[PDB]
């Protein structure tokens, strides 16, 4: 609307090759390639946003005289068909969702 630039540079992509993810219980879990409803099978895809390499330009437009700062990747919980053990499981997994600026005192 008025914003010309972000304080943090990010990258947003479709993730179609996900094999591992940490669930809500903080445990490493195997992510399945396919899910289904009563009729059709679907390939598992996720939308992910993360910080671009530096972590930026220190965030952009930060008052350096008063604050130390860095861009950091934050996450969301998305439901995914996974494998806990022998059984298949529709569980909440942690995935990259944003790139935010975090401040620290000088």
């Amino acid at each position, epitope marked *: 609307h008025r914003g010309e630039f*972000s304080v943090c540079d*990010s990258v*947003s*992509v*479709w993730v179609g090759d996900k094999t591992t993810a940490t669930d809500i219980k903080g445990k490493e879990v195997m992510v399945l390639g396919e899910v289904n409803i009563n009729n059709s099978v679907f*390939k598992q*895809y996720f939308f992910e946003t993360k910080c671009r390499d530096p972590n930026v330009d220190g965030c952009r437009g930060i008052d350096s005289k008063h604050w130390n700062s860095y861009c950091t990747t934050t996450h969301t919980f998305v439901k995914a068909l996974t494998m806990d053990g022998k059984q298949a499981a529709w569980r909440f997994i942690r995935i990259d969702t944003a790139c935010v600026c975090v401040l620290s005192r000088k």
Partner: antibody
Amino acid sequence: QVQLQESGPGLVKPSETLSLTCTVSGFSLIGYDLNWIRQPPGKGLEWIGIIWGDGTTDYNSAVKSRVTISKDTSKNQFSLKLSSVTAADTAVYYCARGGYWYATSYYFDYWGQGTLVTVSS
Amino acid sequence: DIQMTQSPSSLSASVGDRVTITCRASQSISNNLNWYQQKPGKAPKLLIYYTSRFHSGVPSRFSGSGSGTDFTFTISSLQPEDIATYYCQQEHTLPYTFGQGTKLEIKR
């Protein structure tokens, strides 16, 4: 690093099928969307269709019955097929990749240089 | 289908001038509007996305504004390299639609 290059025959006979490929590099065809946009000589731009990262498509209603957009990740290519071709299809065809700023904003960030396709007997 | 109407269709202005291009949507598109610049014989190049956001390698002289139905593209100090056809583009709903373009020439 990001490169898109369209190719195809500059001449298609009316009622035949127009066939274009878009050869890419610098990004994965699984994580990015590809769009086909056309520009008739001396005219504006028209979006024809999209192939999202997941492989799902959507075509503009104006051309819908004649459009086929596919992708070959092994050959780093995207195809466009426009059936039952007429002089209204004479245009510079562009392949453009879509880019996202979260799920908030979408834009055509990288374009090919375009290939002119003429429909004539 | 949302229709984008750009004004003026064509414009001549001197180097150093402030140029203002308008984009008008048929229905509200909120902030889902992009601006492209197409140089003679070249593919369109993205300048602005989400009404006012700068893409990579865009001059500080360019800017975007607007909301819902009314949008603006400004060149603060028009330069000789700005010779191009500018297009606005709606991304609020499918199908994606562009304005008819604003041809920009230089008075010299």
